[PDB]
Nucleic acid binder design. Structure first.
Length: 631
DNA sequence: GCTGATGCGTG
DNA sequence: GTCGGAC
DNA sequence: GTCCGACCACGCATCAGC
C-alpha cells in the first residue's frame, strides 16, 4: 500500500521498504508521501536522505522513471533551453479546482487567499492510481497546449488529475501547477540526493540488486567524505551541462565516476554562469580579497548573454538561466564574424547585452532593452540597438577554459577578439588596490550609466568553477554604500503567502503630492523586514484597519490592498533606481505626461516614528530624484 | 479584430 | 533582483 | 556561508470575452 510509504525510516531498505513492485511504474503517491516527509522536517541533511531513499528505490526498481521523479521534485518540465512552460496560473488552477468540487469560484478564491496555499483547498468511480511518469506527461501535455480554447483544454487535464488524486496527491499537484511547491528543497539538494542515491545503490544492477548501501563497510568519517567527494563530481558536471535529459542517461549506464568523461562542456549547450555576492564597500572588498590580486570592472545594466558558436558556424545565444535567446538577437548572429579573429573556430563568450543609441552613441537604460521583441526574426525591424560587452571567455578552439584563472581567460579574450566600437567592446577595467583609484572607478561607473563595479580575482580562486564557490565574484553597487533613501507613507497591506500565511506579506507605500493634497501610490514593499519587525508591523498597523480607502489616497491601477490602512505610518525605503512606472500614479505628469514613478528593488530599513504622513518624501522630491539620475 | 487580464522571465 | 531564516 | 523561499517592478506574449 503506497499510502503507508515512509522513505524517512531508519535503515531504509531500497527494495523491501518500497511501495511498488520491480518493473512497475512508480506511483505518484510514493512521490507525494516523500514530499510530505521532506516538508515535515527543516534540516536539509534530513531532506536529502529522505529524497535519496526514494531515488534509491527508483533506480533499483524502475530505472526509466528516474528522470520524471527528478523533474517532479525540481518542479520543472525539462531542460531550460527547451522553454516549456505550463501557462497555468492561479485563476486557471482555481477554476479547475472549482469544477472538481462544484463550488463557486469566489469560495475557492477566498480559501486560497486566507490560507496562502491553493493546494489545501484542492485536497479538502475511483480511477486507476496516478503514476509518476503519467503525471509528468500530463504536465508536459498542458504546457504544449496553445491557441484558442487551449485554457479550457488545460482545465480538463487538471480536472482529470484531481479526480484520480488520493490523500496528499491533490495538494502537491496543485502546488506543482501553481509553481509554488514550498518543499524547502531545490536544485542543490536534489543533486545531493541524486549523487547519494546512485552511490549507495549503484545503477544497472540485475534485480535483486546485489548492493544497496555502500556506507555499510566504512566509518562515518569515510562515508561522509565519500558522499561529498562523489557529490562534487555531479555538481561540477551539472554546472557545465545543466541538463538532466543528458546527464541521467549517461549516469544510469556509465556510472557517476566516469560521468565527467562524457558529459563535458561543448559549444551549443548552456552552462551555469558565474554569479556575484554583495559587498558593503571597498573595505569589505580588500578584506575578503586580502592578499589577492583583483580587477575592477563596470557592472553594466542590461541582459547577460552567453554566446556559443559551434564548429561549423552555428551561433546560439542563451540567457543567465539557460534560456534560448537566438531569435531574440538576430543582430548579434550577423555580428559574429566581425568580432572573432580567423584563428577562432569555436568559442563561448560571457557578455552583457545593453541598449545602445546608434545616433547619440551612448548607452540606454535597462527599461529600453526590455522593449525588445523576443521572437523578432525580422532583423531589419529591430528598433532598439544592442552593444555587446564581453567580460569572460569559457571556451576557445575546442578547449575548455574553466580550470584556467581569470587572468588567463582575460589574455585569451583580449587577443583573439576585436573591438568593433559601438557594437562590441571589452568591459571597462582597472587593475589596482588603491582605495582612491577604486573609488574614482565606481563613481565614473555611475557617471557612465552603470550600476557599480565588479570585483573578480585574477589568479587565486579565479577559476570559472561554480561547484567550488558560486559567488566568488563581488558586487559593489552604489545603493549598497550611507550613499538615496525615501521616506514614504503606508496606505494598505496585502495578505501573505507560503512562509507568510497568517501575516502581512506585502505593503503599499505612498508619497505626498503637495500641490494636490493627496497620497500617491509609489510601489509595493515585501522585503527588508525581519519576522520580528513583521510582527510589530502587523501589530502596530492592526488598529489602523479601514473598511474603505480614504478620499485623499490615489493608487490608480495598483493592486487594491486587501486591508486598507489608515495613513499614519512613515517608513524609510531604499531602492536601486527610480523607474518610469506605467502603473503607479506617483509624480505623474511631473516627468512623463501619463506615467508615474516607481522604485526599483525596494526594501525596508526602519520605521520613521519621528515623521508623520505630512512629513514624507514629496512627489516633487521623487520627481527630482528621478531627474537627478543619469538617464 | 480588440482589449483587459495574466503568465512568464528577467533581473 | 533584495532580503531574512534555519541549519 | 549555504540553501531556500518569501517579496519587488516591468516588459512581451498570449488568450477569453467581447
Amino acid at each position: 500500500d503506497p499510502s503507508g510509504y515512509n522513505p524517512a525510516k531508519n535503515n531504509y531498505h531500497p527494495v523491501e521498504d518500497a511501495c511498488w513492485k520491480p518493473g512497475q511504474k512508480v506511483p505518484y503517491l510514493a512521490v507525494a508521501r516523500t514530499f510530505e516527509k521532506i516538508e515535515e522536517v527543516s534540516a536539509r541533511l534530513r531532506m536529502v536522505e529522505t529524497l535519496s531513499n526514494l531515488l534509491r528505490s527508483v533506480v533499483a526498481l524502475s530505472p526509466p522513471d528516474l528522470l520524471p521523479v527528478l523533474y517532479l521534485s525540481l518542479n520543472h518540465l525539462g531542460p531550460p533551453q527547451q522553454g516549456l512552460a505550463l501557462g497555468v496560473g492561479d485563476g486557471v488552477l482555481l477554476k479547475a479546482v472549482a469544477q472538481a468540487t462544484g463550488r463557486q469560484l469566489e469560495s475557492v478564491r477566498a480559501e486560497a487567499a486566507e490560507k496562502g496555499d491553493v493546494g489545501l483547498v484542492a485536497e479538502n468511480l475511483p480511477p486507476p492510481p496516478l503514476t509518476a511518469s503519467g503525471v509528468f506527461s500530463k504536465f508536459r501535455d498542458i504546457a504544449r497546449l496553445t491557441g484558442s480554447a487551449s485554457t479550457a483544454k488545460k482545465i480538463d487535464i487538471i480536472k482529470g488529475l484531481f479526480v484520480a488524486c488520493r490523500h496528499s496527491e491533490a495538494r502537491f499537484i496543485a502546488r506543482s501547477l501553481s509553481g509554488r511547491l514550498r518543499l524547502g528543497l531545490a536544485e542543490q539538494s536534489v543533486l545531493a540526493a541524486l549523487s547519494q542515491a546512485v552511490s549507495l545503490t549503484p545503477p544497472g544492477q540485475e534485480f535483486p540488486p546485489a548492493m544497496v548501501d555502500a556506507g555499510k563497510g566504512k566509518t562515518a568519517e569515510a562515508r561522509k567524505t565519500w558522499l561529498e567527494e562523489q557529490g562534487m563530481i555531479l555538481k561540477q558536471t551539472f554546472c557545465e551541462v545543466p541538463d538532466l535529459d543528458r546527464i541521467i542517461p549517461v549516469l544510469l549506464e556509465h556510472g557517476l565516476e566516469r560521468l565527467p568523461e562524457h558529459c563535458k562542456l561543448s559549444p551549443g549547450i548552456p552552462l551555469k554562469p558565474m554569479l556575484a555576492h554583495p559587498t558593503r564597500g571597498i573595505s569589505e572588498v580588500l578584506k575578503r580579497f586580502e592578499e589577492a590580486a583583483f580587477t575592477c570592472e563596470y557592472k553594466y545594466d542590461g541582459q547577460r548573454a552567453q554566446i556559443h558558436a559551434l564548429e561549423g558556424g552555428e551561433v546560439k545565444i542563451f540567457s543567465r538561466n539557460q534560456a534560448d535567446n537566438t531569435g531574440k538577437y538576430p543582430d548579434i548572429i550577423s555580428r559574429i564574424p566581425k568580432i572573432k579573429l580567423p584563428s577562432v573556430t569555436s568559442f563561448i563568450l560571457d557578455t552583457e547585452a545593453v541598449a545602445w543609441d546608434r545616433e547619440k552613441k551612448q548607452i540606454q537604460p535597462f527599461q529600453v532593452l526590455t522593449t525588445r521583441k523576443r521572437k523578432e526574426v525580422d532583423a531589419s525591424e529591430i528598433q532598439v540597438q544592442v552593444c555587446l560587452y564581453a567580460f569572460d571567455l569559457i571556451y576557445l578552439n575546442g578547449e575548455s577554459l574553466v580550470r584556467e584563472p581569470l587572468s588567463r581567460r582575460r589574455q585569451l579574450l583580449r587577443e583573439n577578439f576585436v573591438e568593433t566600437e559601438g557594437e562590441f567592446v571589452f568591459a571597462t577595467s582597472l587593475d589596482t588596490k588603491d582605495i582612491e583609484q577604486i573609488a574614482e572607478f565606481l563613481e565614473q561607473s555611475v557617471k557612465d550609466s552603470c550600476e557599480g563595479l565588479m570585483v573578480k580575482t585574477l589568479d587565486v580562486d579565479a577559476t570559472y568553477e561554480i561547484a567550488k564557490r558560486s559567488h566568488n565574484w563581488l558586487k559593489l553597487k552604489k545603493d549598497y554604500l550611507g550613499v538615496d533613501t525615501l521616506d514614504l507613507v503606508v496606505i494598505g497591506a496585502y495578505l501573505g503567502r507560503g512562509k507568510r500565511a497568517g501575516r502581512y506579506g506585502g505593503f503599499l507605500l505612498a508619497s505626498y503630492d503637495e500641490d494636490s493634497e493627496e497620497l500617491q501610490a509609489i510601489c509595493k514593499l515585501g522585503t527588508g523586514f525581519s519576522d520580528e519587525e513583521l510582527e510589530e508591523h502587523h501589530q502596530s498597523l492592526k488598529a489602523l484597519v479601514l473598511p474603505s480607502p480614504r478620499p485623499y489616497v490615489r493608487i490608480d491601477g495598483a493592486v487594491i490592498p486587501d486591508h486598507w490602512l489608515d495613513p499614519s505610518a512613515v517608513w524609510e525605503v531604499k531602492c536601486a533606481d527610480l523607474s518610469l512606472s506605467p502603473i503607479y500614479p506617483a509624480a505623474r505628469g511631473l516627468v512623463d505626461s501619463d506615467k508615474g514613478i516607481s522604485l526599483r528593488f525596494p526594501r525596508f530599513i526602519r520605521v520613521r516614528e519621528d515623521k508623520q504622513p505630512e512629513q514624507a518624501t514629496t512627489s516633487a522630491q521623487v520627481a527630482c530624484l528621478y531627474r537627478k539620475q543619469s538617464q
